[PDB]
Amino acid sequence: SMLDDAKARLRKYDIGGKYSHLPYNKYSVLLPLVAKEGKLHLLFTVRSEKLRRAPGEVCFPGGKRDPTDMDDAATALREAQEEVGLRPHQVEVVCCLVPCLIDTDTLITPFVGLIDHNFQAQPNPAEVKDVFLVPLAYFLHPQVHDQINHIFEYTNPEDGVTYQIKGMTANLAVLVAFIILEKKPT
Ligand SMILES: CC1=C(Oc2cccnc2)C(=O)C=C1
């Protein structure tokens, strides 16, 4: 099936707990995979205009590890629940991808999660202004704009709204798209 095929490709890139104990300032992100109308999509958030770190930007659900978290995957699931109301029975965490190093003292660990078909996002307005889906295949032929820095523009055909996706978030999307969609019969 489409979903079994996805998890099997994703598992070949799992680095597991290899880098998880290093003494960094630690953040996790959830890369939420949704199946809709026969195809895979990623779920994104637009950050509230109120936040100190990066108001108004497109990002994956996530945030800073705290003393309650049993492990880095727990940080990502705690944070997704708080931002968009995703409960634990509604997500299967399939792997841990390569972590992202920033600012000399920070390590961001990405987890890929398969989302239940009956999940419906409840955006928390203190943290997220909007939630939207993008088909995974878009990231193989994106509409690119240069600000030199590469920016993706995605227009939702449901309503004509344009979102800008850039930086680490855009890098991770392309990575997931490659892993899952490369080399497939049609
Ligand atoms: C994650 C998920 C879907 O997408 C969305 C999009 C926006 C808000 N909530 C859910 C869906 O249709 C089935 C599970």
Separation of alpha carbons 51 and 25, rounded Å: 19
Tell me the technique behind this structure: X-ray
Separation of alpha carbons 29 and 79, rounded Å: 8
Dihedral sign computed on CA atoms, order 44, 46, 48, 54:
positive
Q: Best substitution site from 119, 122, 163 to test ligand 1's pocket, by max atoms within 8 Å of Cβ?
A: 119
The pair phi, psi for residue 142, each rounded to 5°, is -75, 165
Q: For residue 105, how far is its CA from the centre of ligand 1 (angstroms)?
A: 35
Is the C-beta atom of 120 inside 6 A of ligand 1?
Answer: yes
Place of tokens 């079994």: 4
Q: For residue 68, how far is its CA from the centre of ligand 1 (angstroms)?
A: 28
CB 164 within 8 A of CB 153: yes
Separation of alpha carbons 72 and 22, rounded Å: 12
Q: For residue 121, how far is its CA from the centre of ligand 1 (angstroms)?
A: 6
Is the C-beta atom of 119 inside 6 A of ligand 1?
Answer: yes
Is the C-beta atom of 50 inside 6 A of ligand 1?
Answer: no
**Apex 40 CA angle, 135 and 42, nearest 5:** 60
Quick count: other Cβ atoms within 10 Å of Cβ 147? Answer: 8
Spell out the residues 6+ positions from residue 82 whose beta carbon is closer than 8 angstroms to its own. 124, 127
The ligand 1 atom nearest the CA atom of 119: 14
DSSP 122-136: ---TTTEEEEEEEEG
Residue 38 Ramachandran class (φ > 0 left, ψ -120 to 50 alpha, else beta): left
Q: Best substitution site from 34, 42, 163 to test ligand 1's pocket, by max atoms within 8 Å of Cβ?
A: 34
Torsion angle of the four alpha carbons 52, 55, 59, 62, in this order, in degrees rounded to the nearest 10: 30
Is the C-beta atom of 121 inside 6 A of ligand 1?
Answer: yes
Q: What's the longest Cα–Cα distance across the chain?
A: 47
Is residue 73 helix, strand or coil? Answer: helix
At 15, the amino acid letter reads I
Q: Give Cα separations from 33 to 49, 113, 114 (angstroms).
A: 26, 6, 5
Among candidate residues 116, 134, 117, 123, the one with its CA nearest the CA of residue 174:
134
Separation of alpha carbons 58 and 47, rounded Å: 6
Resolution in A: 2.0
Is the C-beta atom of 128 inside 6 A of ligand 1?
Answer: no
Tokens of 61: 């659900």
**Apex 143 CA angle, 140 and 144, nearest 5:** 100
Among candidate residues 149, 109, 119, the one with its CA nearest the CA of residue 33:
119
Domain boundaries, the chain: 1-186
Q: Give Cα separations from 83 to 29, 60, 143 (angstroms).
A: 12, 10, 28
CB 27 within 8 A of CB 109: yes
